[PDB]
Design an enzyme around this catalytic site. Structure first.
Site, short mmCIF file in Angstrom:
data_model
loop_
_atom_site.label_atom_id
_atom_site.label_comp_id
_atom_site.label_asym_id
_atom_site.label_seq_id
_atom_site.Cartn_x
_atom_site.Cartn_y
_atom_site.Cartn_z
N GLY A 50 -12.68 -11.89 -5.41
CA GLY A 50 -14.00 -12.23 -4.53
C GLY A 50 -13.67 -11.97 -3.03
CB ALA A 51 -10.84 -11.44 -1.00
CG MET A 69 -7.61 -4.74 1.04
SD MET A 69 -6.78 -4.32 -0.35
CE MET A 69 -5.18 -3.73 0.22
N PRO A 70 -10.03 -4.20 3.89
CG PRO A 70 -9.55 -5.05 6.13
CD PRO A 70 -9.24 -5.40 4.84
CB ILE A 71 -11.07 1.43 2.64
CG1 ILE A 71 -11.80 1.88 4.02
CG2 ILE A 71 -12.02 0.41 1.87
CD1 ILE A 71 -13.10 2.92 3.54
CG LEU A 72 -7.39 3.18 8.53
CD1 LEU A 72 -6.46 4.13 7.53
CD2 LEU A 72 -8.63 4.20 8.63
N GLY A 73 -5.52 0.71 6.50
CA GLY A 73 -4.43 -0.21 7.06
C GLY A 73 -3.41 0.29 7.70
N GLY A 86 0.56 0.99 7.93
CA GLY A 86 1.73 0.94 7.20
C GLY A 86 3.02 0.81 8.30
CG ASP A 145 1.66 -2.09 3.25
OD1 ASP A 145 1.28 -2.56 2.14
OD2 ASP A 145 3.01 -1.47 3.08
CE1 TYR A 165 8.58 -0.85 2.90
CE2 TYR A 165 6.78 -1.78 4.00
CZ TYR A 165 7.32 -1.24 3.11
OH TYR A 165 6.66 -0.41 2.13
CE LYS A 203 3.94 -2.83 -0.01
NZ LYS A 203 4.58 -2.48 1.48
CG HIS A 249 8.06 -3.18 -2.76
ND1 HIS A 249 8.41 -3.68 -1.41
CD2 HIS A 249 7.72 -1.96 -2.56
CE1 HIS A 249 8.59 -2.52 -0.64
NE2 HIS A 249 8.05 -1.54 -1.26
#
Ligand SMILES: NC(=O)c1ccc[n+]([C@@H]2O[C@H](COP(=O)([O-])OP(=O)(O)OC[C@H]3O[C@@H](n4cnc5c(N)ncnc54)[C@H](OP(=O)(O)O)[C@@H]3O)[C@@H](O)[C@H]2O)c1
Ligand SMILES: COc1ccc2c(C(=S)N(C)CC(=O)O)cccc2c1C(F)(F)F
Length: 315
Positions: free
Chosen positions: A9-10, A12-16, A18, A43, A48, A77, A110
């Site tokens: 139901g949420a 999500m922006p298609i550009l994030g 990294g 992301d 990392y 992740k 991940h």
């Protein structure tokens, strides 16, 4: 169209942005600049080793009234050494404390491969094969579900799962929440038509990683093809008066994918976002798809060994 509806139901922006290989000394600025110029999706990952610094940027922009927490979409992740059900909450809780958040919008497994637990992220034997753990991914999925039910994460998903492995989760006995996202490598040299079509058919959104071909990956070899220097792709860019990178980011967007280019360079960060004012033609799209060659940035030959290694099958 800037956000895609997930099966929880949420939106999500298609550009994030990294953050893999984003140095800890530069990534706080990179995330601040990204927020300042429009990004609302970051992301992240514990492995990392830069989540604390990402979190400093997020918190400063919250404090400065630049953005509201509800408008951000923060992804992290679960690393491989934390697949045991007993370790999942704590792994999540570390990531939350570092990012200075009280929930994640999306938390991914991940990699399908569990590694032996301990302080080492990449445990190897006395020969170098990764040392696996005896954790079943269904059991790890049950632990991810509990996180949702605890309010620690709004959505759960997977990454680097092949078709059998996505199918394995979807057929889990007692499945309570379907994965929302499958985050996989995807670019004109690895176009993933079958896996993408399979996931979408199930209502699972695909995120495309290494969309520029990860030219800063530490294992780059001269003989490797190069998306950003491919004359065919440069030409398509030139026809639309955009850069190559902009074409490589727009391409997954037109396939109904989410895409997460990394940069720590302020001008590139801003450039990489200016991808909503142009469209590749159907012919462009078909052409870019024709460049597929099953080339992976993340081939991870030391893992070929593992039971759940996802890339024995093309998809
Ligand atoms: N789930 C997984 O298993 C997984 C695996 C790999 C990656 N990912 C995610 O995907 C993100 C993106 O993939 P990636 O980091 O592998 O690589 P990528 O986004 O394909 O490429 C990053 C590289 O491209 C450069 N770059 C960025 N914008 C550019 C532009 N406009 N022009 C020219 N060069 C540009 C960056 O340099 P500067 O930074 O120096 O500008 C960096 O060297 C990661 O950071 C990570 O968040 C997930
Ligand atoms: C599942 O196995 C992985 C997964 C990720 C890595 C990475 C990482 S952290 N990435 C490729 C980035 C990412 O996984 O997001 C780097 C080196 C070896 C890895 C391995 C390897 F097994 F090769 F050690």
């Amino acid at each position: 169209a800037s956000r895609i509806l997930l099966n929880n139901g949420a939106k999500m922006p298609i550009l994030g942005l990294g953050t893999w290989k984003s140095p800890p000394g530069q990534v706080t600025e990179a995330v601040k600049v990204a927020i300042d110029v429009g990004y609302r999706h970051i992301d992240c990952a514990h492995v990392y080793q830069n989540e604390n610094e990402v979190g400093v940027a997020i918190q400063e922009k919250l404090r400065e009234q630049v953005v509201k927490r509800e408008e951000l979409f923060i992804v992290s992740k679960l690393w491989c050494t934390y697949h045991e059900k007993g370790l999942v909450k704590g792994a999540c809780q570390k990531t939350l404390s570092d990012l200075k958040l009280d929930y994640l919008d999306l938390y991914l497994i991940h990699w399908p491969t569990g590694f032996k637990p301990g302080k080492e992220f990449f445990p190897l034997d006395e020969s170098g094969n990764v040392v696996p753990s005896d954790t079943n991914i269904l059991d790890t999925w049950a632990a991810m579900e509990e996180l949702v039910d605890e309010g620690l994460v709004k959505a759960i998903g997977i990454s680097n799962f092949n078709h059998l492995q996505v199918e394995m989760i979807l057929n889990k006995p007692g499945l309570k929440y379907k994965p929302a996202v499958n985050q996989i490598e995807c670019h004109p040299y690895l176009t993933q038509e079958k896996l993408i079509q399979y996931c979408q058919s199930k209502g699972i959104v695909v995120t495309a990683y290494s969309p520029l071909g990860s030219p800063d990956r530490p294992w780059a070899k001269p003989e490797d093809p190069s998306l950003l220097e491919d004359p065919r792709i440069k030409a398509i860019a030139a026809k639309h008066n955009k850069t190559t990178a902009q074409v490589l980011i727009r391409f997954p967007m037109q396939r109904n994918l989410v895409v997460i280019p990394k940069s720590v360079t302020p001008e590139r960060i801003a450039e990489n976002f200016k991808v909503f004012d142009f469209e590749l033609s159907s012919q462009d799209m078909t052409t870019l798809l024709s460049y597929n060659r099953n080339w992976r940035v993340c081939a991870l030959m030391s893992c070929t060994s593992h039971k759940d290694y996802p890339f024995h099958e093309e998809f």
